[PDB]
Curated annotation (Swiss-Prot), chain A:
It comes from Saccharomyces cerevisiae (strain ATCC 204508 / S288c). Acts in a DNA repair pathway for removal of UV-induced DNA damage that is distinct from classical nucleotide excision repair and in repair of ionizing radiation damage. Functions in homologous recombination repair of DNA double strand breaks and in recovery of stalled replication forks. The modification Phosphoserine is found at S15. The gene is KRE29. It comes from the Eukaryota. The chain holds residues 87 to 140 of 464 of the full protein. Component of the Smc5-Smc6 complex which consists of KRE29, MMS21, NSE1, NSE3, NSE4, NSE5, SMC5 and SMC6. Interacts with NSE5. It is found in: Nucleus; Cytoplasm. This is DNA repair protein KRE29.
UniProtKB/Swiss-Prot annotation, chain C:
Sumoylated by MMS21. Transmembrane segments: none annotated. This is Structural maintenance of chromosomes protein 5. The gene is SMC5. Component of the Smc5-Smc6 complex which consists of KRE29, MMS21, NSE1, NSE3, NSE4, NSE5, SMC5 and SMC6. It is found in: Nucleus; Chromosome. The flexible hinge domain, which separates the large intramolecular coiled coil regions, allows the heterotypic interaction with the corresponding domain of smc6, forming a V-shaped heterodimer. Belongs to the SMC family. SMC5 subfamily.
Curated annotation (Swiss-Prot), chain D:
Present with 339 molecules/cell in log phase SD medium. It is found in: Nucleus; Chromosome. Acts in a DNA repair pathway for removal of UV-induced DNA damage that is distinct from classical nucleotide excision repair and in repair of ionizing radiation damage. Functions in homologous recombination repair of DNA double strand breaks and in recovery of stalled replication forks. Probably plays a role in structure. This is Structural maintenance of chromosomes protein 6. Component of the Smc5-Smc6 complex which consists of KRE29, MMS21, NSE1, NSE3, NSE4, NSE5, SMC5 and SMC6. It comes from Saccharomyces cerevisiae (strain ATCC 204508 / S288c). The flexible hinge domain, which separates the large intramolecular coiled coil regions, allows the heterotypic interaction with the corresponding domain of SMC5, forming a V-shaped heterodimer. The chain holds residues 289 to 336 of 1114 of the full protein. Belongs to the SMC family. SMC6 subfamily.
Amino acid sequence: PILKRTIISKRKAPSNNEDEEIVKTPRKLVNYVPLKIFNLGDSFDDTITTTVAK
Amino acid sequence: VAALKEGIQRQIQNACAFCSKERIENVDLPDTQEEIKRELDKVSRMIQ
Amino acid sequence: QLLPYVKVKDHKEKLNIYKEEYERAKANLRAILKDKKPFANTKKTLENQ
Amino acid sequence: KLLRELNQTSDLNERKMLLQAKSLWIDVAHNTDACKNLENEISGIQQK
Amino acid sequence: FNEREADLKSQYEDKKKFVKEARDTPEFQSWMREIRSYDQDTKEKLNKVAEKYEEEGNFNLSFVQDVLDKLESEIAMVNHDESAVTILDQVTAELRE
């Protein structure tokens, strides 16, 4: 009823989440920038628990 | 690649500091990071 | 009991972004297809030249 | 007795330590596979 | 321009494949069955708890992180549960006796 319609999202409510710029923004020919030092995880520190394991 | 290799060297030094990197590969766990993050949160809550 | 809110919201957001990407891609494809014919006409004029 | 309780908690703690070490090892594996992909890309660019 | 338009057409076909994959998902197959499950008990207490949940969600200003945080907190709370719950009436009855 009202709950289902409020929970559901109308496809017309937004502009189909349109992106910025008519076409995709240009990028550098290499532009690798690997980074990715941490992939998720993190949270509790490893050094303290490693000392706890020792 | 040199910066990524330096980062990999720091990560492997941390892995050697924390138990051992070579002693972890034998254990079986899903590769997906999101599942591992959820498991870490679950075990952290269990420890709390 | 109801539709999963996180999943429905994620599905709606991904559908919206996919639809807008499809719309921009089809608009660009129509524009390039319309623009291609003058290039063929210019090639014909250049062969006449 | 508190130490035995600490051992019971430490079983989960070492399980969490193994899970975090597995997460760090998978992060290292992701970095290494991405480095291998960058090496393949640089090898293709070097071939070009 | 022909190779660029061929690449754009290939990207457009890939985007159409992604759009087609976005719909008719196993999650969509799960949908319209959860609607039947909700229709099994219509409103009443379920409407009130749903309104309370909606109020909590809009107050939290989150729809994904808030739900996951609440789910993790409730699972952690349920982890310590059912402590000596096997006998509840007999102990009270013997205490009263």
